[PDB]
């Protein structure tokens, strides 16, 4: 229910307005991300153990720090509004990744003719 | 009078148009001679084809050429514009504008100098000085 993906008509840095409450919206997005991906596809896959662990790491640094600036210098991304914008779409990415199940075997073997260039 | 004012219309397709607008630059100015080009094929006299000439362009070029009054000349500015030039071996290039429009003064080379374009212009005006149209009404 977090409608603070991106705001409207305020003046932040690069053509994307400033969200009002970035910490509660972001911690709700991390909670929803952990609720979706963990309960859909198995913990065997490296993809879950990567997205999940990075998600918990970001969750830790958000839930610890207070201002919207120290969280930047620890998060390794750009602006915190843009951190929220980034943090939106992996929820929908894992949500799509429910479908087209990638942790299965490789569905196609090319003929090995296709991957020959020279020598 | 025809030799004095002498304005073209830009057709101006490529690099050779960059040298054409260098003739409008202050170093080798057009307006010290009278060359004040309009962007309109009826108000024009001569039609400088500059740049290479695609296969795709050429009907538009001949349609521009036809809506142009009768004392008309054509300058082929640039090697590509005459005898196809540096491409000449494309599927999509026209091997010289001699396949499209009749030309009265050629101008050689990829991009010819602003010097070169003005030298071609003075050679065209030197041709104008031998037009002898009134005494050709008298049938000399």
């Amino acid at each position: 229910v977090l409608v603070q993906m991106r705001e409207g008509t305020p003046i932040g840095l690069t053509g994307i307005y400033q969200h009002p409450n970035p910490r509660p919206a972001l911690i709700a997005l991390y909670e929803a991300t952990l609720k979706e991906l963990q309960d859909k596809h198995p913990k065997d896959s490296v993809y879950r153990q990567s997205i999940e662990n990075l998600t918990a790491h970001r969750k830790q640094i958000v839930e610890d720090n207070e201002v919207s600036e120290v969280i930047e210098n620890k998060i390794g991304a750009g602006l915190i509004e843009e951190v929220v914008i980034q943090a939106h779409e992996e929820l929908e990415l894992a949500k799509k990744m429910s479908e087209w199940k990638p942790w299965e075997e490789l569905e196609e073997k090319p003929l090995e003719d296709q991957w020959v260039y020279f020598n | 009078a025809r030799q004095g004012s002498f304005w073209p219309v830009t057709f101006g397709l490529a690099c050779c148009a960059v040298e054409m607008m260098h003739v409008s630059a202050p170093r080798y100015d057009q307006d010290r001679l009278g060359i004040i080009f309009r962007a309109s094929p009826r108000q024009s006299d001569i039609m400088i084809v500059a740049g290479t000439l695609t296969n795709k362009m050429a009907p538009v070029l001949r349609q521009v050429y036809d809506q142009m009054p009768e004392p008309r000349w054509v300058i082929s500015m640039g090697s590509c514009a005459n005898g196809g030039g540096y491409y000449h071996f494309s599927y999509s290039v026209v091997r010289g504008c001699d396949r499209i429009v009749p030309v009265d003064v050629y101008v050689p080379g990829c991009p010819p100098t602003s010097e070169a374009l003005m030298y071609g212009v003075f050679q065209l005006q030197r041709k104008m000085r031998n037009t002898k149209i009134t005494r050709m009404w008298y049938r000399k």
Binding site: - | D98, I100, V101, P102, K132, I133, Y138, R139
Partner: protein, 318 residues
Amino acid sequence: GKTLIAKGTGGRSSRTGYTATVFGANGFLGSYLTAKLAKHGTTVVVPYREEMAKRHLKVTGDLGVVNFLEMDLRNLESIDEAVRHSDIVVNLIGREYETKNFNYYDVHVEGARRIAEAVKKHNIARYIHVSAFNAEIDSPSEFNHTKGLGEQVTKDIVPWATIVRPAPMFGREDKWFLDRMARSPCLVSANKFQETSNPVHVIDVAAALERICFDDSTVAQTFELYGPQKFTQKQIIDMVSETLRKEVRHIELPKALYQAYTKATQAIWWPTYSPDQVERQFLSQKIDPSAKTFNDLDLTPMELPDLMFKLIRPYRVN
């Protein structure tokens, strides 16, 4: 002159080697025949008289297939030079009006005699001379009288004389067949306001002249290029006014009263409607019973009206 397989090739610059020379050719008919002639790889010497009018015949071919020489029918040496190197030569020549320096004589009689004398002095194979329709030796249109004299002179010397007599022609920028229909401020003439004859389309004239100018076994025959079917009168003006403007407005003036405009015509900067045209308005196609046509040279020339739909259609109302 001896050659290889036939005329019609399938690609430009697969060049022939036939070296032609076309007189006139700046104006009306000589556009399309050298357009058909340089299209298929033949060297053309086209002489001219006006420098600014010769330009639009250059783009028909690319290289060596169009050349300019500065002829003039006064100068013997110019025409002498003009067909030194030629192989075939046609002359479409002759204004439809006298100039301020030319008679109707010696624009296709002694003008023809000079160039045919150059032909005989150069042994040029395949001399083709166009001449007018209705080319009699009678007076009434001294144009026609002079064309009959010209055919007589071209048969006096040079038995290599393929004379061709086209009808009134029909093409883009028709000098006095459709320009007096298209612009037509008040087309007013023809005391006999009907009773003309055969029209022939111009590209069919050019195809006839092309298919005569290369094949042999046609030396000294004379051709007349008949209209395909209709041989129609000035009622085609009505079909011209089938286009919605109907501005044609023929006012059918008296004959001797019409002379004054023609006598005005000699004073003007530009030619208008000189009186041998007015006299030819009293004539018709005195069609030769024995002259080979499009059916002999294996062509079928196109009809009038459906071609006129294409040919006059800038000039509609909406």
